[PDB]
Amino acid sequence: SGPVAESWCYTQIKVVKFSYMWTINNFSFCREEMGEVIKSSTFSSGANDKLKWCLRVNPKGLDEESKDYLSLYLLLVSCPKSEVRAKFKFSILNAKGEETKAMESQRAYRFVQGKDWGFKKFIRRDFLLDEANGLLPDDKLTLFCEVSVVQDSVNISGQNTMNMVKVPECRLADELGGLWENSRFTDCCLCVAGQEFQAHKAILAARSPVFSAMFEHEMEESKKNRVEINDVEPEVFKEMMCFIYTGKAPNLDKMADDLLAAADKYALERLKVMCEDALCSNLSVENAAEILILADLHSADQLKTQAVDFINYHASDVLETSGWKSMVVSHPHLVAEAYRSLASAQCPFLGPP
Amino acid sequence: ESWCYTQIKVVKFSYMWTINNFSFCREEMGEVIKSSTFSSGANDKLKWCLRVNPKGLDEESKDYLSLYLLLVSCPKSEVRAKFKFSILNAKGEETKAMESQRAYRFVQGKDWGFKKFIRRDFLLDEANGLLPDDKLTLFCEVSVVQDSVNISGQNTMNMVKVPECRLADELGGLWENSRFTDCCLCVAGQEFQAHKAILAARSPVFSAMFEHEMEESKKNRVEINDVEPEVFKEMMCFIYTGKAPNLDKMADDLLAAADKYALERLKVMCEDALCSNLSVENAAEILILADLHSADQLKTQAVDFINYHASDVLETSGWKSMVVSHPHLVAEAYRSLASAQCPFLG
């Protein structure tokens, strides 16, 4: 009925979920017979670094039980002494990046120092070595795993009192937003592209250091009315004014480039981050060069980071586009950071090739 | 999410060496064979040597010919190398020749290989076509595969921070800094300076007085006397920031100040503060305050409280003064006691 129910509780057995990728070259050329140990890098959750795990796979399964079967084991490197009760599931990733053979453990298994659980007889050697399945491109076996570590109980309690009265929500942005559109009690003109806008100092000085420096430097005594702005056009300046007065950006998508450039010009940090987030969702193969150029010109740190990530991931289809061919001639330094980014992350020294 | 990948790169190299007069060398010198040593690998640091015995070194191996991979010195103490020697098809022979299926760990100062390669009589028989020009060329590519450690990569994205809006705190700081002030608000002699536009946007009473043409005089010389200093400071803070931190201790006078200037949100917020502070001693006082300032919600809540705690409230002095000073408040209490309840037996 949703009657508030006076007191409430919001218990949460939080479970952190992450994965770990492993791919071995020339799987058929290893032949680790009868428990010969091959180790992998110590991998943690990624959300901070508290406990470390590492896999351990035996292509020729140890012991007479898994003599003709692959033995796959998961080992704990370090963790707090708490008898960690966590889930593990293992599956083989195909060439097309789709999970195929899902083997899930039925419980959260207990882990301590030196302990290593795993689904023994994971896959038949006869079926594993069968290349007809197509899961070994270039004789490479890829391991896909999902794990569900749990911290075992953190709960919430109370209160949500009656609250007989009904206070209205804060109307600061809404009512102060109407100040711009009605343009009441404003004093100083603001001309862009021959189009005049009327805005007053205090809000601008509060929400943009650039105008704070510009207005105070002797112009307000004499030249308060007319101010010279021509780097931007009116249909983006309207959104800039609306955001400054109100703190919201409704028409953000249609002007994510010019608005970002203007925010860079006027040092609107939050508006810059909103524009970066909105434009970065528009990332595509065809428009990579332009967004890299825009980020580099306007010093959009997060935008340039995600853009170099995207181009490092999808360079196979971007270079043929004319954007790269113009950017090389116009921006050789951009080519420099592109090569630096691509040549260290994913094909650093021919591993992987 | 780590890109571990356990790169298992193997070091291999090409090699050339020809054996001359292999047919009758056994008659020439015999069994103990010594060949030239060669260096390869990382800048020729690794030492290797390959030679072919025409007959068994010991009595047992006299039957099968020995192709032993002598290794005086090894690259590393731990070398789990599955050595796979091969030939570049001088004739057609790539099966039935002994290829290592399981090797042994190579350690410094130790040599390992295989001593059985092919039958002596069968090899010497020219009918099998295993005598290309009475010479065999070796291409010994040693496949050391112990190097496995390592590479990695985090591969995290995390999207964007998207910092929250700070309009409230920004305008609060603007109030504290008092920059580009347009009008001066004078209270009890003490003078405050605040901006016209924000006041008019938030509080209609301030807005109206800056619109009736009284502009040449009342911009800088507005008199605000019916309010105290602290109440006006708190109300100015609410006007600018949108928060009322010091509200809970000063409810009644702040409600009066809000009532004068029509700030609805602060009015209802003070009503919330007062409503959950009711006591039987001052329920009459709270009801009088709510009715005087046209605060409907607190008025109704205090009336319901006094109805529920009527048996005790009528003994108080506040009610006994309200009955004299405010009769229609008693009329409202009676209405909300009777018309909103009953019948009850009789």
UniProtKB/Swiss-Prot annotation, chain B:
Q: What is its main location?
A: nucleus
Q: Which PANTHER family match?
A: SPECKLE-TYPE POZ PROTEIN (PTHR24413)
Required for nuclear localization: region residues? 52-172
What organism does the record attribute this protein to? Homo sapiens
Q: In which pathway is this protein known to take part? A: Protein modification; protein ubiquitination
Q: What tissues has this protein been observed in? A: Widely expressed.
Give the protein name, as stated in the record.
Speckle-type POZ protein
Spell out the SUPFAM superfamilies in the cross-references: POZ domain, TRAF domain-like
Domain MATH per the UniProt entry, residue ranges: 12-142
Q: What is the effect of changing residue 64 to C?
A: In NSDVS2; dominant-negative, increased BET proteins stability
The protein's assembly and partners: Interacts with GLI2 and GLI3. Homodimer and homooligomer. Heterodimer with SPOPL. Each dimer interacts with two CUL3 molecules. Part of cullin-RING-based BCR (BTB-CUL3-RBX1) E3 ubiquitin-protein ligase complexes that contain CUL3 and homodimeric SPOP, or the heterodimer formed by SPOP and SPOPL, plus a target protein, such as MACROH2A1, PDX1/IPF1, BMI1, BRMS1 and DAXX. Interacts with IRF1; this interaction mediates IRF1 proteasomal degradation. Interacts with HNF1A.
What is the disease in the record? Nabais Sa-de Vries syndrome 1: An autosomal dominant disorder characterized by global developmental delay, impaired intellectual development, speech delay, and variable behavioral abnormalities. Affected individuals show congenital microcephaly and dysmorphic facial features, including round face, small palpebral fissures, highly arched eyebrows, and short nose. Nabais Sa-de Vries syndrome 2: An autosomal dominant disorder characterized by global developmental delay apparent from birth, impaired intellectual development, speech delay, dysmorphic facial features, and additional anomalies including congenital heart defects, sleep disturbances, hypotonia, and variable endocrine abnormalities.
Q: GO cellular component terms? A: Cul3-RING ubiquitin ligase complex; cytoplasm; nuclear speck; nucleoplasm; nucleus
Q: Mind listing the GO molecular function terms for this protein?
A: identical protein binding; molecular function inhibitor activity; ubiquitin protein ligase binding
Q: Give additional notes from the record.
A: Antigen recognized by serum from scleroderma patient.
Domain named BTB: residues: 154-278
Per the record, which residues fall in region Important for binding substrate proteins?
A: 104-114
Keywords recorded for this protein, A-Z:
Cytoplasm, Host-virus interaction, Intellectual disability, Nucleus, Ubl conjugation pathway
Please give the function described in this protein's UniProt entry.
Component of a cullin-RING-based BCR (BTB-CUL3-RBX1) E3 ubiquitin-protein ligase complex that mediates the ubiquitination of target proteins, leading most often to their proteasomal degradation. In complex with CUL3, involved in ubiquitination and proteasomal degradation of BRMS1, DAXX, PDX1/IPF1, GLI2 and GLI3. In complex with CUL3, involved in ubiquitination of MACROH2A1 and BMI1; this does not lead to their proteasomal degradation. Inhibits transcriptional activation of PDX1/IPF1 targets, such as insulin, by promoting PDX1/IPF1 degradation.
